[PDB]
């Protein structure tokens, strides 16, 4: 499913991401925008045998299990496939753990590159939340 900007913002707010660990809603919508362009189905393959999964491109090395990634930790204790769900529950729950691991939202390279320190509130401007 390809979420709409305001649709995702609303869904992310409903999931407790608005200001989760000091990160405003805009950061999460912006992160989703550059990580997966709002597509819950998105997947990215790397060069270290790991795959990125879903709306927030969660990696198969530390967070989810896909059974083919070396040095896997599965810290979110869930199969990566569950992260390709149409609803964003699984991805959000895992992201909450990630953002709490010690690097904040920096764990998402796309966020760091294109969102961090920008007017992220713009990602929810014309949204009825």
């Amino acid at each position: 499913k390809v979420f709409g900007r305001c649709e995702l913002a609303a869904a992310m707010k409903r999931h407790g991401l608005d200001n989760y660990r000091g990160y405003s809603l805009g950061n999460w919508v912006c992160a989703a925008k550059f990580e997966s362009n709002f597509n819950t189905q998105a997947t990215n393959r790397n060069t270290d045998g790991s795959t990125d999964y879903g709306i927030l491109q969660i990696n198969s090395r530390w967070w989810c299990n896909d059974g083919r990634t070396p040095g896997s930790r599965n810290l979110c204790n869930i199969p990566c496939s569950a992260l390709l769900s149409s609803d964003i529950t699984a991805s959000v729950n895992c992201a909450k753990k990630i953002v709490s691991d010690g690097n904040g939202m920096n764990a998402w390279v796309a966020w760091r590159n294109r969102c961090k320190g920008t007017d992220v509130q713009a990602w929810i401007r014309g949204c009825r939340l």
């Epitope: 189905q41 997947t43 393959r45 790397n46 060069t47 270290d48 045998g49 299990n65 896909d66 059974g67 083919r68 990634t69 070396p70 199969p79 990566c80 496939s81 390709l84």
Partner: antibody
């Protein structure tokens, strides 16, 4: 205990299409990727693509993308690979394998013969 | 794609002798390289995983080494049952790619 059982040898004429099946058991079917490999004599093993059963997620290697289509039926632990607009270059043995980085569990392979 | 070049293409060895097979990658794949043995009309059998991890149940005579772009498969004390083709395959990137294979025949 993990096992992958593929469909039998196939013969089709060019222009036609075929659907090979890979039924996998002994493990959680929706967690592992199923990867497809093509092997021809005088040719190196070629990775065709992959599908994550039940998630609707796929990935193709264009050498065979506009002509390859993966699908899966979670209710029977079966993954399918469809090849369209067949030509003699498609003649080969096709394998499905569970994605473990390395390939430890292989289907027995299905031989496709494309001829008039 | 990462290209795996296997050298040599064939090998003739007397039982009891020890030999080596080479697989070189066009670009670094760390230790994400695996080795297989394939008999005629059979599915490839995994022998060595992640460069040096011997698959369980596999004869001790099989060893793997290397790192980055140069890998080696060692078959020590070759036995008659060892005839067949051996391949290396990298899982570092997608598409996964395979080496062109090394056919091992028994010298008698």
């Amino acid at each position: 205990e993990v096992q992958l059982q593929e469909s039998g040898a196939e013969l089709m004429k060019p222009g036609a299409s075929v659907k090979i099946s890979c039924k996998a058991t002994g493990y959680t079917f929706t967690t592992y990727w199923i990867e497809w490999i093509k092997q021809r004599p005088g040719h190196s093993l070629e990775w065709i693509g992959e599908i994550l059963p039940g998630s609707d997620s796929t990935y193709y290697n264009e050498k065979v993308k506009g002509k390859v289509t993966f699908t899966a039926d979670a209710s029977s632990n079966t993954a399918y690979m469809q090849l369209s607009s067949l030509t003699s270059e498609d003649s080969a043995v096709y394998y499905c394998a569970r994605g473990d980085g390395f390939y430890v569990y292989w289907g027995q392979g299905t031989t496709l013969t494309v001829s008039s | 794609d990462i290209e795996l070049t296997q050298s040599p293409a064939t090998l003739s060895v007397t039982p009891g002798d020890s030999v080596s097979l080479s697989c070189r990658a066009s670009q670094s794949i760390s230790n994400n390289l695996h080795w297989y043995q394939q008999k005629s009309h059979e599915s490839p059998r995994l022998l060595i995983k992640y460069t040096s991890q011997s698959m369980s149940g596999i004869p001790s005579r099989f060893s793997g080494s290397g790192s980055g772009t140069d890998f080696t498969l060692s078959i020590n004390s070759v036995e008659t049952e060892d005839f067949g083709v051996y391949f290396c395959q990298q899982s570092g990137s997608w598409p996964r790619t395979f080496g062109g294979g090394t056919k091992l025949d028994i010298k008698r």
